PDB file of C-alpha atoms and ligand atoms in Angstrom:
ATOM      1  CA  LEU W   1     135.916 162.199 -11.047  1.00  0.00           C
ATOM      2  CA  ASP W   2     134.171 164.848 -12.665  1.00  0.00           C
ATOM      3  CA  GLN W   3     131.509 162.551 -14.131  1.00  0.00           C
ATOM      4  CA  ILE W   4     131.181 160.471 -10.860  1.00  0.00           C
ATOM      5  CA  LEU W   5     130.635 163.504  -8.645  1.00  0.00           C
ATOM      6  CA  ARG W   6     128.162 164.904 -11.060  1.00  0.00           C
ATOM      7  CA  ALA W   7     125.689 161.819 -10.333  1.00  0.00           C
ATOM      8  CA  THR W   8     126.488 161.944  -6.637  1.00  0.00           C
ATOM      9  CA  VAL W   9     125.789 165.702  -6.105  1.00  0.00           C
ATOM     10  CA  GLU W  10     122.403 165.046  -7.752  1.00  0.00           C
ATOM     11  CA  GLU W  11     121.653 162.250  -5.547  1.00  0.00           C
ATOM     12  CA  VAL W  12     122.272 164.268  -2.235  1.00  0.00           C
ATOM     13  CA  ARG W  13     120.140 167.159  -3.062  1.00  0.00           C
ATOM     14  CA  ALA W  14     117.329 164.767  -4.165  1.00  0.00           C
ATOM     15  CA  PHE W  15     117.527 163.186  -0.608  1.00  0.00           C
ATOM     16  CA  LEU W  16     118.394 166.493   1.367  1.00  0.00           C
ATOM     17  CA  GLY W  17     115.997 168.292  -0.979  1.00  0.00           C
ATOM     18  CA  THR W  18     118.149 171.151  -0.302  1.00  0.00           C
ATOM     19  CA  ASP W  19     118.073 173.890  -3.317  1.00  0.00           C
ATOM     20  CA  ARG W  20     121.761 173.650  -3.699  1.00  0.00           C
ATOM     21  CA  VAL W  21     124.421 171.220  -2.810  1.00  0.00           C
ATOM     22  CA  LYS W  22     128.066 171.137  -4.316  1.00  0.00           C
ATOM     23  CA  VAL W  23     131.401 169.479  -3.914  1.00  0.00           C
ATOM     24  CA  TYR W  24     134.443 171.608  -3.136  1.00  0.00           C
ATOM     25  CA  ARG W  25     137.853 170.442  -3.814  1.00  0.00           C
ATOM     26  CA  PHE W  26     141.119 172.124  -2.606  1.00  0.00           C
ATOM     27  CA  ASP W  27     144.401 172.627  -4.629  1.00  0.00           C
ATOM     28  CA  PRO W  28     147.725 172.821  -2.591  1.00  0.00           C
ATOM     29  CA  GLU W  29     148.370 176.034  -4.429  1.00  0.00           C
ATOM     30  CA  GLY W  30     145.454 177.576  -2.648  1.00  0.00           C
ATOM     31  CA  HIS W  31     142.853 177.574  -5.557  1.00  0.00           C
ATOM     32  CA  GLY W  32     139.660 175.695  -5.238  1.00  0.00           C
ATOM     33  CA  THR W  33     137.213 174.216  -7.866  1.00  0.00           C
ATOM     34  CA  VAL W  34     133.477 173.361  -7.896  1.00  0.00           C
ATOM     35  CA  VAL W  35     133.349 170.354 -10.098  1.00  0.00           C
ATOM     36  CA  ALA W  36     130.137 169.224  -9.509  1.00  0.00           C
ATOM     37  CA  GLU W  37     126.873 171.112  -8.581  1.00  0.00           C
ATOM     38  CA  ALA W  38     123.046 170.246  -8.101  1.00  0.00           C
ATOM     39  CA  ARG W  39     120.535 173.427  -8.353  1.00  0.00           C
ATOM     40  CA  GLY W  40     117.236 173.675  -7.080  1.00  0.00           C
ATOM     41  CA  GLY W  41     115.170 174.542 -10.120  1.00  0.00           C
ATOM     42  CA  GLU W  42     117.139 177.942 -10.792  1.00  0.00           C
ATOM     43  CA  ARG W  43     116.289 180.197  -7.474  1.00  0.00           C
ATOM     44  CA  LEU W  44     120.019 180.590  -6.682  1.00  0.00           C
ATOM     45  CA  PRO W  45     122.598 180.771  -9.674  1.00  0.00           C
ATOM     46  CA  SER W  46     124.992 178.182 -10.851  1.00  0.00           C
ATOM     47  CA  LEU W  47     128.370 178.396  -9.432  1.00  0.00           C
ATOM     48  CA  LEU W  48     130.059 175.476 -11.367  1.00  0.00           C
ATOM     49  CA  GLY W  49     133.117 175.872 -13.429  1.00  0.00           C
ATOM     50  CA  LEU W  50     134.243 178.833 -10.965  1.00  0.00           C
ATOM     51  CA  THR W  51     137.459 178.599  -9.101  1.00  0.00           C
ATOM     52  CA  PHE W  52     137.064 179.427  -5.400  1.00  0.00           C
ATOM     53  CA  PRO W  53     140.268 180.036  -3.220  1.00  0.00           C
ATOM     54  CA  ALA W  54     140.769 178.305   0.090  1.00  0.00           C
ATOM     55  CA  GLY W  55     140.746 181.756   1.706  1.00  0.00           C
ATOM     56  CA  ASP W  56     137.026 181.327   2.285  1.00  0.00           C
ATOM     57  CA  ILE W  57     137.991 179.286   5.011  1.00  0.00           C
ATOM     58  CA  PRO W  58     140.623 180.169   7.925  1.00  0.00           C
ATOM     59  CA  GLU W  59     141.693 177.537  10.204  1.00  0.00           C
ATOM     60  CA  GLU W  60     140.370 177.463  13.813  1.00  0.00           C
ATOM     61  CA  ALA W  61     136.770 176.780  12.309  1.00  0.00           C
ATOM     62  CA  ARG W  62     137.994 173.506  10.538  1.00  0.00           C
ATOM     63  CA  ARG W  63     139.498 172.251  13.510  1.00  0.00           C
ATOM     64  CA  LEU W  64     136.248 171.700  15.209  1.00  0.00           C
ATOM     65  CA  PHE W  65     135.079 169.893  12.273  1.00  0.00           C
ATOM     66  CA  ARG W  66     138.314 167.947  12.413  1.00  0.00           C
ATOM     67  CA  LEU W  67     137.527 167.308  16.092  1.00  0.00           C
ATOM     68  CA  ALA W  68     133.867 166.942  16.411  1.00  0.00           C
ATOM     69  CA  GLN W  69     132.398 165.982  13.078  1.00  0.00           C
ATOM     70  CA  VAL W  70     128.938 167.532  13.373  1.00  0.00           C
ATOM     71  CA  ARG W  71     129.371 170.115  10.707  1.00  0.00           C
ATOM     72  CA  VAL W  72     126.307 172.482  10.856  1.00  0.00           C
ATOM     73  CA  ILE W  73     125.868 176.211  10.094  1.00  0.00           C
ATOM     74  CA  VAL W  74     122.971 177.809  11.961  1.00  0.00           C
ATOM     75  CA  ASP W  75     120.394 180.411  10.554  1.00  0.00           C
ATOM     76  CA  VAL W  76     122.240 183.715   9.918  1.00  0.00           C
ATOM     77  CA  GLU W  77     119.222 185.336  11.097  1.00  0.00           C
ATOM     78  CA  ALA W  78     119.799 183.886  14.665  1.00  0.00           C
ATOM     79  CA  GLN W  79     122.882 185.913  14.673  1.00  0.00           C
ATOM     80  CA  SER W  80     125.235 183.347  16.429  1.00  0.00           C
ATOM     81  CA  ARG W  81     128.994 184.349  16.320  1.00  0.00           C
ATOM     82  CA  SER W  82     131.966 182.695  16.565  1.00  0.00           C
ATOM     83  CA  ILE W  83     135.430 184.438  17.273  1.00  0.00           C
ATOM     84  CA  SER W  84     139.261 184.114  17.760  1.00  0.00           C
ATOM     85  CA  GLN W  85     140.999 184.442  21.136  1.00  0.00           C
ATOM     86  CA  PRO W  86     144.627 184.959  22.493  1.00  0.00           C
ATOM     87  CA  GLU W  87     147.028 181.886  22.239  1.00  0.00           C
ATOM     88  CA  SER W  88     145.643 178.883  23.452  1.00  0.00           C
ATOM     89  CA  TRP W  89     146.356 175.298  23.806  1.00  0.00           C
ATOM     90  CA  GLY W  90     145.211 171.828  24.740  1.00  0.00           C
ATOM     91  CA  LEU W  91     142.858 171.616  21.666  1.00  0.00           C
ATOM     92  CA  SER W  92     144.900 168.586  20.248  1.00  0.00           C
ATOM     93  CA  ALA W  93     143.776 166.919  23.602  1.00  0.00           C
ATOM     94  CA  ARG W  94     140.651 166.054  21.890  1.00  0.00           C
ATOM     95  CA  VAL W  95     138.233 166.623  24.687  1.00  0.00           C
ATOM     96  CA  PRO W  96     134.786 165.125  24.213  1.00  0.00           C
ATOM     97  CA  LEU W  97     132.308 167.583  22.896  1.00  0.00           C
ATOM     98  CA  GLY W  98     133.203 170.640  25.225  1.00  0.00           C
ATOM     99  CA  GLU W  99     131.174 172.853  22.934  1.00  0.00           C
ATOM    100  CA  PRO W 100     127.565 173.764  22.136  1.00  0.00           C
ATOM    101  CA  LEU W 101     125.954 171.560  19.431  1.00  0.00           C
ATOM    102  CA  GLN W 102     126.419 174.334  16.868  1.00  0.00           C
ATOM    103  CA  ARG W 103     129.207 176.007  15.242  1.00  0.00           C
ATOM    104  CA  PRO W 104     128.352 179.680  15.111  1.00  0.00           C
ATOM    105  CA  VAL W 105     129.919 181.803  11.929  1.00  0.00           C
ATOM    106  CA  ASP W 106     131.695 185.029  12.444  1.00  0.00           C
ATOM    107  CA  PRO W 107     129.848 188.003  10.884  1.00  0.00           C
ATOM    108  CA  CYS W 108     132.296 188.230   8.000  1.00  0.00           C
ATOM    109  CA  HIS W 109     130.783 184.889   7.301  1.00  0.00           C
ATOM    110  CA  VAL W 110     127.150 186.012   8.056  1.00  0.00           C
ATOM    111  CA  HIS W 111     127.289 188.270   4.976  1.00  0.00           C
ATOM    112  CA  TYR W 112     129.111 185.747   2.934  1.00  0.00           C
ATOM    113  CA  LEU W 113     126.046 183.473   3.428  1.00  0.00           C
ATOM    114  CA  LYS W 114     123.218 186.251   3.311  1.00  0.00           C
ATOM    115  CA  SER W 115     125.118 187.933   0.112  1.00  0.00           C
ATOM    116  CA  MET W 116     124.252 184.596  -1.516  1.00  0.00           C
ATOM    117  CA  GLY W 117     120.675 185.209  -0.094  1.00  0.00           C
ATOM    118  CA  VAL W 118     121.050 181.960   1.921  1.00  0.00           C
ATOM    119  CA  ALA W 119     119.693 181.626   5.313  1.00  0.00           C
ATOM    120  CA  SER W 120     121.033 178.276   6.426  1.00  0.00           C
ATOM    121  CA  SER W 121     123.501 175.998   5.393  1.00  0.00           C
ATOM    122  CA  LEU W 122     124.610 172.033   6.011  1.00  0.00           C
ATOM    123  CA  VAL W 123     128.111 170.711   5.650  1.00  0.00           C
ATOM    124  CA  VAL W 124     129.877 167.703   5.601  1.00  0.00           C
ATOM    125  CA  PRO W 125     133.625 167.586   4.981  1.00  0.00           C
ATOM    126  CA  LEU W 126     135.012 164.920   2.507  1.00  0.00           C
ATOM    127  CA  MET W 127     138.021 163.250   4.176  1.00  0.00           C
ATOM    128  CA  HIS W 128     140.119 160.321   3.519  1.00  0.00           C
ATOM    129  CA  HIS W 129     141.702 158.680   6.341  1.00  0.00           C
ATOM    130  CA  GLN W 130     143.520 161.680   8.045  1.00  0.00           C
ATOM    131  CA  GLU W 131     143.353 163.786   5.198  1.00  0.00           C
ATOM    132  CA  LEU W 132     140.827 166.423   3.604  1.00  0.00           C
ATOM    133  CA  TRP W 133     140.317 166.337  -0.140  1.00  0.00           C
ATOM    134  CA  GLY W 134     137.242 168.789  -0.281  1.00  0.00           C
ATOM    135  CA  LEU W 135     134.296 170.270   1.373  1.00  0.00           C
ATOM    136  CA  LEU W 136     130.713 169.558   1.133  1.00  0.00           C
ATOM    137  CA  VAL W 137     128.210 172.305   1.653  1.00  0.00           C
ATOM    138  CA  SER W 138     124.238 172.841   0.983  1.00  0.00           C
ATOM    139  CA  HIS W 139     122.493 175.924   0.794  1.00  0.00           C
ATOM    140  CA  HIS W 140     118.828 176.804   0.865  1.00  0.00           C
ATOM    141  CA  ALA W 141     116.652 179.926   1.208  1.00  0.00           C
ATOM    142  CA  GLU W 142     115.269 179.255   4.776  1.00  0.00           C
ATOM    143  CA  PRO W 143     116.317 179.244   8.415  1.00  0.00           C
ATOM    144  CA  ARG W 144     115.169 175.951   9.467  1.00  0.00           C
ATOM    145  CA  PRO W 145     116.592 173.648  12.198  1.00  0.00           C
ATOM    146  CA  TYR W 146     118.368 170.231  11.234  1.00  0.00           C
ATOM    147  CA  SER W 147     117.765 166.811  12.903  1.00  0.00           C
ATOM    148  CA  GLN W 148     120.770 164.937  14.124  1.00  0.00           C
ATOM    149  CA  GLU W 149     119.062 161.431  13.149  1.00  0.00           C
ATOM    150  CA  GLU W 150     118.580 162.172   9.438  1.00  0.00           C
ATOM    151  CA  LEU W 151     122.032 163.862   9.292  1.00  0.00           C
ATOM    152  CA  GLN W 152     123.840 160.891  10.115  1.00  0.00           C
ATOM    153  CA  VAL W 153     122.153 158.748   7.474  1.00  0.00           C
ATOM    154  CA  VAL W 154     123.645 161.367   4.812  1.00  0.00           C
ATOM    155  CA  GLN W 155     126.714 161.778   7.055  1.00  0.00           C
ATOM    156  CA  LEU W 156     127.030 158.218   5.810  1.00  0.00           C
ATOM    157  CA  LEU W 157     126.030 159.188   2.340  1.00  0.00           C
ATOM    158  CA  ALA W 158     129.322 161.347   2.204  1.00  0.00           C
ATOM    159  CA  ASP W 159     131.376 158.760   3.604  1.00  0.00           C
ATOM    160  CA  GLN W 160     130.792 156.766   0.426  1.00  0.00           C
ATOM    161  CA  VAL W 161     131.888 159.535  -1.644  1.00  0.00           C
ATOM    162  CA  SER W 162     135.057 159.772   0.593  1.00  0.00           C
ATOM    163  CA  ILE W 163     135.615 156.328  -0.945  1.00  0.00           C
ATOM    164  CA  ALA W 164     135.136 157.616  -4.409  1.00  0.00           C
ATOM    165  CA  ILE W 165     137.321 160.522  -4.330  1.00  0.00           C
ATOM    166  CA  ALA W 166     139.848 158.533  -2.545  1.00  0.00           C
ATOM    167  CA  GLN W 167     139.479 155.426  -5.167  1.00  0.00           C
ATOM    168  CA  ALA W 168     139.449 157.994  -7.666  1.00  0.00           C
ATOM    169  CA  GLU W 169     142.918 159.716  -6.765  1.00  0.00           C
ATOM    170  CA  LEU W 170     144.672 156.285  -7.411  1.00  0.00           C
ATOM    171  CA  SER W 171     143.134 155.447 -10.624  1.00  0.00           C
ATOM    172  CA  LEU W 172     143.664 159.209 -11.963  1.00  0.00           C
TER     173      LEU W 172
HETATM  174  C1  CYC G 201     135.834 186.076   7.442  1.00  0.00           C
HETATM  175  C2  CYC G 201     136.613 187.027   8.079  1.00  0.00           C
HETATM  176  C3  CYC G 201     136.591 184.732   7.310  1.00  0.00           C
HETATM  177  C4  CYC G 201     135.493 183.696   7.097  1.00  0.00           C
HETATM  178  C5  CYC G 201     134.790 182.993   8.063  1.00  0.00           C
HETATM  179  C6  CYC G 201     134.202 181.620   7.948  1.00  0.00           C
HETATM  180  N1  CYC G 201     133.669 180.992   7.053  1.00  0.00           N
HETATM  181  C7  CYC G 201     133.980 179.607   7.344  1.00  0.00           C
HETATM  182  C8  CYC G 201     133.833 178.557   6.492  1.00  0.00           C
HETATM  183  C9  CYC G 201     133.221 178.366   5.365  1.00  0.00           C
HETATM  184  N2  CYC G 201     133.475 178.767   4.029  1.00  0.00           N
HETATM  185  C10 CYC G 201     132.322 178.179   3.155  1.00  0.00           C
HETATM  186  C11 CYC G 201     132.570 178.165   1.728  1.00  0.00           C
HETATM  187  C12 CYC G 201     131.841 177.794   0.550  1.00  0.00           C
HETATM  188  N3  CYC G 201     130.878 178.479   0.185  1.00  0.00           N
HETATM  189  C13 CYC G 201     130.701 178.191  -1.064  1.00  0.00           C
HETATM  190  O1  CYC G 201     130.101 178.708  -1.922  1.00  0.00           O
HETATM  191  C14 CYC G 201     131.448 177.256  -1.409  1.00  0.00           C
HETATM  192  C15 CYC G 201     132.113 176.747  -2.789  1.00  0.00           C
HETATM  193  C16 CYC G 201     133.612 177.153  -3.204  1.00  0.00           C
HETATM  194  C17 CYC G 201     131.959 176.885  -0.103  1.00  0.00           C
HETATM  195  C18 CYC G 201     132.888 175.535  -0.011  1.00  0.00           C
HETATM  196  C19 CYC G 201     131.616 177.829   4.141  1.00  0.00           C
HETATM  197  C20 CYC G 201     129.722 178.199   3.651  1.00  0.00           C
HETATM  198  C21 CYC G 201     131.790 177.622   5.367  1.00  0.00           C
HETATM  199  C22 CYC G 201     131.424 176.661   6.308  1.00  0.00           C
HETATM  200  C23 CYC G 201     132.030 175.286   6.275  1.00  0.00           C
HETATM  201  C24 CYC G 201     133.332 175.413   7.501  1.00  0.00           C
HETATM  202  O2  CYC G 201     132.676 175.219   8.782  1.00  0.00           O
HETATM  203  O3  CYC G 201     134.275 175.201   7.170  1.00  0.00           O
HETATM  204  C25 CYC G 201     133.862 179.607   8.624  1.00  0.00           C
HETATM  205  C26 CYC G 201     133.222 178.370   9.484  1.00  0.00           C
HETATM  206  C27 CYC G 201     132.168 178.949  10.529  1.00  0.00           C
HETATM  207  C28 CYC G 201     132.373 178.811  11.894  1.00  0.00           C
HETATM  208  O4  CYC G 201     132.839 179.756  12.473  1.00  0.00           O
HETATM  209  O5  CYC G 201     131.941 177.778  12.544  1.00  0.00           O
HETATM  210  C29 CYC G 201     134.395 180.691   9.089  1.00  0.00           C
HETATM  211  C30 CYC G 201     135.343 180.905  10.446  1.00  0.00           C
HETATM  212  N4  CYC G 201     135.515 183.220   5.544  1.00  0.00           N
HETATM  213  C31 CYC G 201     136.515 183.836   5.233  1.00  0.00           C
HETATM  214  O6  CYC G 201     137.012 183.573   4.140  1.00  0.00           O
HETATM  215  C32 CYC G 201     137.553 184.671   6.392  1.00  0.00           C
HETATM  216  C33 CYC G 201     138.756 183.746   6.764  1.00  0.00           C
END
């Protein structure tokens, strides 16, 4: 798996031309590891070999990803913010869209990205069937808008991997 994702992570970056994109897996114990990583020359540092905990992600945010599969983080400069609210229900209903074409990230996240000096970020969760095995994330030093058309082509490119991460689970 480690080897296969090393070649895949490189292929995406070359296409998305993003300075940094890597694969993130999740361990039931809460620990997460980056087993693959493509870097743009050397503007941003290498995070490979470093274990990141799931704490990085809460829950509600993941819901929309599991609900609307668009997966996009807007310019940390535009200052768009997401937030929690009193008890609520009917989310499982799976209502078509029903929300903006973006997923604002709470300030706590704003710094998280900015602290890394990244103005924008593209994501594409790696899931097999009904399960999520990891998280795809791209980072670059620029607050630029993304196109839905080009996004899909890659969205599919990630689907392929979904097969590799899955097909790999059996062999391994
Ligand atoms: C702050 C109080 C809370 C928080 C907010 C928050 N962040 C996310 C989710 C993400 N976390 C990542 C993780 C990564 N960056 C890396 O370097 C790595 C390698 C291990 C990863 C995979 C990022 C960039 C995301 C975006 C993906 C996603 O949407 O799940 C969000 C989502 C934004 C939104 O509101 O739509 C939230 C809510 N971070 C915390 O740890 C607190 C729970």
